[PDB]
Design a protein around this ligand. Structure first.
Ligand SMILES: [Mg+2]
Lengths: 222, 222
DNA sequence: CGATCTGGTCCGACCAGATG
DNA sequence: CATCTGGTCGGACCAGAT
């Protein structure tokens, strides 16, 4: 696909300093011809990339190429994963860590402000296929569920940005049985902790599951 | 601006259930004419909104309208702020909260993994204009700085998605002198803690500044 | 040889900021 | 005001989906 091709081409070039961050993108009129698509297409592509933080469009001035690390949002996680294959592993570990540490914040909060709701999400733990694809979504829906269940939606949005790569990684991890089991427990355990009002035992819990689930996923990759 | 007008109009409609989430967007051909712009423009806008997660475009099928809460990332913060004026206040408190609670995670980490770097960011604390606009950026650069300084870039990206509204809020808060002072302290204090390897006192600290800096912003608004 | 609704891409002309 | 750059027109033509 033209647009598809176009976007990859630009992103590609920006990635491996062909269109270095800090520089200027070739005028739309030449860039399009140079790419092999019509302005119209390029145009739509520049508008999309612009929204992901890759570029800075300003009527009448060359379009600036940015350092994503400076203007790109959690939405480029899947991309920064397809560009640097050798990094992926680490990148994942970082993603998972962020989830763990961050979730403790809102999980512990959700159990405090709206336990009634937090229990409703942890409820979805039951009635669920024993298939990877299924879990992945549930699991995600659980963490994203609890995040909103904190009353501070922003965590929810944060979770939204992580969906993309999180799930993919899940679809692979939850293929393993030993993994599906750990989660269920982690879930049931949380729900217990929420009911028993053991709010002060959440961190220790969440912290482990991360570590444990982490170790499994580690063996699955090695 | 056409594109400008168009986007607002669509986002506007999606906001106050004119184009309810879960429904279908009028065909591009009629929607354009209905808005007052040419398909070419509308098209660019649909591609933009599409990336922010507002729509789901699939060649050949109607464009689905989404529940942003489900697919939008931290980048709609500035938007969810312009749409719901009455919520802004709360919306900000939430943002700041997120900042505080999340930051201890990476600030504490950064002090462990790369003190050397974390000290280089806290260094910018000095040599800085005593003007709001200035600080705002410094302050943001400092937290974003420490985020990357933790080795887990993901926090950095998270901070990126927050830049928008965070700064705007800053530009208003840092106009107050009493605010500018509190930060400096928080910065210097952070740098000491880092130097002294007081790795276990950070939470207590960061937590306060938030509370204290929060109280000031509170009085500034009331 | 289905008919039709909907998106994707292409042209080439013109409007309109930014800046020498 | 010249020209570089992006922004908007419209109204032809290709292509997936039911
Ligand atoms: Mg030239």
């Amino acid at each position: 696909s033209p647009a598809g091709f176009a976007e990859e081409y630009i992103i590609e070039s920006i990635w491996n300093n062909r269109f270095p961050p800090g520089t200027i993108l070739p005028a739309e009129r030449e860039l399009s011809e140079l790419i092999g698509v019509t302005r119209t297409t390029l145009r739509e592509v520049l508008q999309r990339l612009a929204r992901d933080g890759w570029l800075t469009i300003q009527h009448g001035k060359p379009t600036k190429v940015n350092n994503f690390w400076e203007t790109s949002g959690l939405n480029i996680l899947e991309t920064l994963a397809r560009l640097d294959h050798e990094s992926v592993p680490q990148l994942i570990d970082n993603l998972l860590s962020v989830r763990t540490n961050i979730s403790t914040i809102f999980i512990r909060t959700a159990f405090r402000q709206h336990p009634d709701k937090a229990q409703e999400v942890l409820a979805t733990a039951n009635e669920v296929a024993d298939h990877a694809d299924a879990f992945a979504e549930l699991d995600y829906n659980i963490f994203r569920g609890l995040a909103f269940a904190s009353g501070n939606p922003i965590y929810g949005l944060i979770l939204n940005g992580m969906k993309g790569l999180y799930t993919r990684i899940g679809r692979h991890y939850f293929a393993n049985p030993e993994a599906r089991s750990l989660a269920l427990g982690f879930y049931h355990k949380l729900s217990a902790l929420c009911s028993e009002g053991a709010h002060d035992q959440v961190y220790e819990t969440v912290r482990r599951y991360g570590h444990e689930s982490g170790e499994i996923w580690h063996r699955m990759q090695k």
